[PDB]
Design an enzyme around this catalytic site. Structure first.
Site, PDB file in Angstrom:
ATOM      1  N   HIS A  32       0.969  -1.346  -0.122  1.00 26.42           N
ATOM      2  CA  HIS A  32       0.105  -0.112  -0.023  1.00 26.42           C
ATOM      3  C   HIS A  32       0.954   1.370  -0.141  1.00 26.42           C
ATOM      4  O   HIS A  32       1.786   1.523   1.089  1.00 26.42           O
ATOM      5  CB  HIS A  32      -1.055   0.013   1.035  1.00 26.42           C
ATOM      6  N   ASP A  59       0.772   5.270   0.003  1.00 25.59           N
ATOM      7  CA  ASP A  59      -0.051   6.497  -0.084  1.00 25.59           C
ATOM      8  C   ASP A  59       0.873   7.423  -0.846  1.00 25.59           C
ATOM      9  O   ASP A  59       2.086   7.499  -0.560  1.00 25.59           O
ATOM     10  CB  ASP A  59      -0.031   6.953   1.299  1.00 25.59           C
ATOM     11  N   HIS A  79      -6.964   9.385  -0.825  1.00 25.18           N
ATOM     12  CA  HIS A  79      -7.446   9.267   0.655  1.00 25.18           C
ATOM     13  C   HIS A  79      -6.768  10.034   1.698  1.00 25.18           C
ATOM     14  O   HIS A  79      -7.396   9.844   2.846  1.00 25.18           O
ATOM     15  CB  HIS A  79      -7.875   7.829   0.849  1.00 25.18           C
TER      16      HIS A  79
END
Ligand SMILES: OC[C@H]1N/C(=N\O)[C@H](O)[C@@H](O)[C@@H]1O
Ligand SMILES: [Zn+2]
Length: 1016
Positions: free
Chosen positions: A61, A63, A442
């Site tokens: 993941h 970001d 996000h």
């Protein structure tokens, strides 16, 4: 032909509003699966003829900004992850890896030499590296507008098609904080076949798990037939990390995260470390792991099991690739060879999992439930509801909507022509689309990044706005100059944009004054653009250096105008009051501009020596005790003073509004004959808990219901004009303004929370509408969903995203509040609406950010307030999960999100000026929008291609006779059309070759894309 989206309640297996109404939400200790139960399985379920197929899917993941900036993470982490993935996948043909964030991938790939690009293409082509979703980012789903969700998806997928020759059909959304049905809406219209989600309320995971409803066909709330449905897998556990992805017991699953044995500075908080797999322990370790897998498999309907293997910024170190791969290979070799397990486990990709699930479905092994609704508001544990981020960093949330519109307008304006490469149009548009796309992350628009990262996003968006202005202004100059006179220098500024509402008065004095004078320059051309595909009138305002200014159109027809002072509000530390100052060197001129569909209109501002015939002047009244004079330079009308008192105003034939002596709306009277309907604005504040969990950027954990802001005796300024009137009041932390132009008022709040630590400021509307526990909020600006306030849930759980609007209604009356920025809001009692303005939080909320929210800055929030009689409207039945706007409310939303753009000619004389562009463009039905117009080809292409995204909303029928409107055929907007194709919404696949090269209009609530091809 079209589905009726109002009158038929869809029959689905799970409807999330109905489920919420029945569910208990009790937070009971479930054992090792803390929010579930002790899962039991029949060992005899799997056997030689029916094995459990397990796909372990490595992932990382990444970001694109959070606690470091995009570029800092790229340098520190992501470039190493991708470089090492390339090497390890190349060297280990059975290893697999999925990748989501194309912003990082593109950043990486363009630093690669040709040899490594070739290697990368090969591991993609052979299926080892698989892109999932393929958007620029993994976007927020609460605050993002659907247009920008599509923008970012298209940015990443276009990159992937061009450079990797792949288009993902499976989506991976493991981290947005709650999930919206706008995603499957857009995905299914973009070629997708499957999607995965993770962050849903723990009570919802438990409920759906018990029924094996974690995989479902997710359709839109209004969709009776089911043609919008997209297969969706919801992961069942608390996190996407390895401890929460192997099975229900994280103490066991953590032992299979081989990065946690010490040398990587990670450990297992459940206190049992992983151990290297060996011959002496592989049977025991396999037993533990398979047991977790078979428990997880109990929650799903097929014999195919998805086991993600990853965490944040994983697969960085070479040693990490080795430790995960080798240990899992040892487990697979043992497990797959031992018949008693009846398991076949392998590294896989997401698409491989979904393909195998659908093979099982096709084999009759499972049928899946249908579901509609959304998954807001998320809580990950206890009463920790993630409704804070609906409002966090509201300045940047508002900036998102401003840049959204400027990207649309720049792409549209420049699309009408092919541009020489020297104009750098493509370059500037790519930069603007990419910076806006990045912000949809996000941790971007959500306001959950570190202060320095918020700064990076703001700087990027500022550069994007400049790029948009450059493209727009060159485009206007070309569209409105006689062709044989047109003489561009692609570096010059022919016009500057004037924006009345961003950053906004009291936020930034950025607006240029038009300087006119008998001895310098008698007049000035201004141009308005209208990005919407229908004729539009809107009042526009400019700052001018004299009150004596008249307006004409380019046929020299007088245009009625109103001049008002330029008022600015200041916290006077000498008097300890918030009061307005009038400029003595500039004035505001306001007039109605009328602009063609997707077109331009030119007006002229001319100075004179005395009051012009067709220009009126507003009166001004300052209501306060102990007033002092307010001179206005040359302004011809003296300011009046009075003690505070109730006041009423009416512009045009529009409503009559009444205000309290504190300058806040108290009632609206729609017609001369109608009642004064109570509609009261109030500002309140929420605090933070002293004991227990603290609010932060993510979480909203109020210490009880909001308390009224003490207003004292505020200064109220009333401006009354023929075209525009307003009441403005300086309240603590907010300059609140109600503006009237003859329809639904506009509300503007200049919000400066200052140093009020641990405070959230809310604006509430109190009415007598008998709404009960029902209210409606939008999802991504696309649809309105019915909400029910549940007293079984805490206050913060009853907060929902308000990305563009919200409403309450009863049988007779509706009040709709439209917003120009996403914020959080609710209806906490019958007849109430409320929306949070800003929040300043001194503590961290234990979600990894490691800071409060103490970087607030003044922001100008904008709204429209629409009070309507709805007894005659044809509305959905009580059981329908959707609601729909009226025409007036939809137009009001459009006035906030896509206003007219204003351009001021930058030099003294514009030779070859033209009066209008687009006079011949069709004026489409009001519910239809051209959401995107984008030229897809550079100037050297023999066949030019222009893409259009058409969206039709659904408006309530309330007995206004429908008028004549022209059919819009986007394929014939540009000349020499040779082909018209319907495409996926990203423009990347042709779906239908259209007869007669005519693009049909779309059905209510549908969105379609078309590409027209032109010989050039
Ligand atoms: O706790 C949520 C937070 N934590 C994360 N990792 O620990 C997410 O990647 C980041 O996007 C998110 O804001
Ligand atoms: Zn994340």
């Amino acid at each position: 032909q079209c589905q009726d989206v109002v009158q038929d309640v869809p029959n689905v297996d799970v409807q999330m509003l109905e489920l919420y109404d029945r569910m208990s939400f009790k937070d009971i200790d479930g054992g090792v699966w803390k929010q579930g139960w002790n899962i039991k399985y029949d060992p005899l379920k799997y056997n030689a003829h029916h094995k459990l197929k397990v796909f372990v899917v490595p992932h990382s993941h990444n970001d694109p900004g959070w606690i470091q900036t995009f570029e800092e993470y790229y340098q520190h982490d992501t470039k190493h992850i991708l470089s090492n993935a390339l090497r390890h996948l190349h060297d280990n043909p059975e290893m697999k890896f999925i990748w989501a964030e194309i912003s990082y991938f593109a950043r990486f790939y363009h630093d690669l030499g040709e040899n490594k690009k070739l290697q990368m293409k090969s591991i993609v082509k052979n299926g080892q590296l698989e892109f999932v979703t393929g958007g620029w980012v993994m976007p927020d789903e609460a605050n993002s507008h659907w247009r920008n969700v599509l923008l970012q998806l298209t940015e990443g997928q276009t990159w992937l098609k061009q450079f990797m020759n792949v288009t993902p059909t499976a989506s991976w959304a493991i981290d947005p904080f709650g999930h919206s049905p706008t995603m499957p809406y857009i995905l299914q219209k973009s070629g997708f076949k499957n999607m995965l989600i993770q962050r849903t309320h723990y009570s919802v995971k438990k409920e759906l798990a018990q029924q094996r409803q974690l995989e479902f066909l997710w359709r839109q709330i209004w969709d009776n037939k089911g043609d919008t449905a997209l297969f969706t897998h919801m992961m069942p556990f608390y996190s996407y990390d390895i401890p929460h992805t192997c099975g229900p017991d994280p103490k066991v699953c953590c032992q299979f995260d081989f990065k946690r044995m010490g040398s990587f500075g990670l450990s297992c908080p459940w206190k049992v470390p992983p151990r290297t797999i060996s011959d002496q322990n592989v049977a025991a370790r396999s037993d533990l792991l398979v047991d977790q897998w078979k428990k997880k498999a109990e929650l799903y309907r097929t014999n195919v099991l998805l086991i993600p293997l990853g965490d944040d910024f994983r697969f960085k170190q070479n040693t990490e690739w080795d430790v995960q791969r080798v240990n899992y290979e040892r487990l697979f070799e043992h497990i797959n060879s031992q018949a008693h397990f009846n398991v076949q486990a392998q590294f896989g990709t997401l698409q491989e999992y979904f393909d195998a699930v659908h093979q099982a479905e096709r084999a009759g092994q499972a049928e899946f439930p249908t579901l509609s609704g959304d998954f807001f508001t998320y809580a990950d544990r206890s009463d920790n509801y993630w409704s804070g981020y609906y409002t966090s960093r509201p300045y940047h949330k508002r900036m998102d909507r401003v840049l959204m519109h400027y990207v649309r307008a720049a792409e549209m304006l420049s699309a009408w022509h092919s541009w020489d490469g020297m104009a750098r149009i493509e370059e500037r548009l790519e930069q603007a689309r990419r910076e806006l796309s990045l912000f949809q992350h996000h941790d971007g628009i959500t306001g959950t990044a570190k202060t320095h990262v918020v700064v990076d996003y703001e700087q990027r968006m500022q550069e994007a706005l400049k790029a948009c202005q450059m493209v727009m202004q060159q485009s206007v100059y070309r569209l409105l100059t006689k062709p044989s006179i047109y003489s561009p220098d692609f570096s010059f500024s022919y016009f500057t944009l004037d924006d009345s509402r961003w950053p906004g008065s009291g936020v930034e004095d950025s607006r240029t004054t038009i300087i006119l004078g008998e001895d310098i320059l008698p007049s000035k051309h201004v141009v308005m653009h209208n990005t919407l595909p229908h004729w539009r009138e809107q009042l526009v305002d400019f700052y001018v250096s004299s009150p004596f200014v008249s307006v004409t159109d380019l046929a020299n027809n007088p245009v009625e105008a109103q001049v008002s002072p330029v008022w600015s509000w200041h916290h006077d530390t000498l008097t300890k009051t918030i009061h307005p100052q009038g400029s003595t060197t500039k004035y505001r001129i306001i007039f109605k501009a009328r602009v063609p569909p997707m077109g331009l209109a030119t007006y002229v501002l001319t100075i004179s020596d005395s009051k012009p015939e067709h220009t009126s002047y507003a009166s001004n009244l300052l209501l306060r005790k102990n007033p002092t004079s307010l001179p206005l330079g040359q302004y011809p009308e003296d300011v009046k003073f009075g003690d505070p008192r109730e006041i009423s105003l009416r512009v045009g034939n529009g409503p009559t509004l009444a205000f309290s002596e504190q300058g806040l709306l108290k009632s609206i009277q729609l017609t001369q004959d109608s009642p004064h309907v109570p509609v009261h604005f109030k500002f309140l504040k929420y605090g933070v808990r002293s004991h227990g969990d603290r609010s932060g950027a993510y979480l909203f954990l109020p210490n009880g219901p909001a308390s009224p802001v003490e207003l004292g005796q505020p200064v109220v300024l009333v401006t009354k004009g023929k075209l525009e009137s307003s009441v403005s009041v300086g309240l603590p932390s907010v300059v609140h303004q109600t503006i009237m132009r003859g329809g639904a008022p506009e509300i503007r709040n200049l919000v400066d929370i200052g140093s009020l630590d641990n405070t959230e400021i809310v604006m509430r509307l109190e009415t007598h509408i008998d709404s009960g526990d029902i209210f409606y909020t939008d999802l991504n600006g696309l649809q309105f969903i019915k909400r029910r306030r549940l007293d079984k849930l805490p206050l913060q759980a009853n907060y929902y995203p308000i990305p563009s609007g919200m409403f309450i209604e009863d049988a007779n009356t509706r009040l709709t509040l439209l917003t120009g920025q996403p914020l959080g809001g609710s209806s906490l009692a019958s007849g109430e609406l409320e929306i949070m303005q800003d929040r300043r939080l001194a503590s961290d909320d234990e979600r990894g950010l490691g800071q409060g929210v103490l970087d607030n800055k003044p922001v100008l929030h904008i709204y429209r307030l629409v009070l309507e009689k709805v007894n005659n409207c044809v509305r959905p039945s009580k059981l329908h999960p959707a609601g729909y706007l009226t025409s007036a409310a939809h137009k009001a939303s459009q006035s906030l999100l896509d206003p007219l753009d204003k351009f001021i000619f930058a030099e003294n004389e514009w030779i070859g000026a033209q009066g209008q562009f687009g006079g011949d463009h069709p004026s489409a039905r009001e519910d239809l929008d051209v959401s995107v117009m984008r030229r897809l080809t550079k100037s050297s292409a023999k066949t030019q291609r222009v893409g259009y995204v058409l969206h039709r909303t659904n408006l309530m029928q309330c007995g206004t006779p429908e008028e004549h409107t022209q059919k819009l055929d986007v394929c014939h907007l540009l000349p020499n059309v040779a082909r018209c194709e319907r495409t996926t919404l990203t423009f990347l696949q042709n779906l239908e070759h259209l007869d007669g090269m005519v693009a049909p209009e779309v059905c209510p609530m549908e969105t379609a894309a078309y590409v027209s091809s032109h010989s050039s």
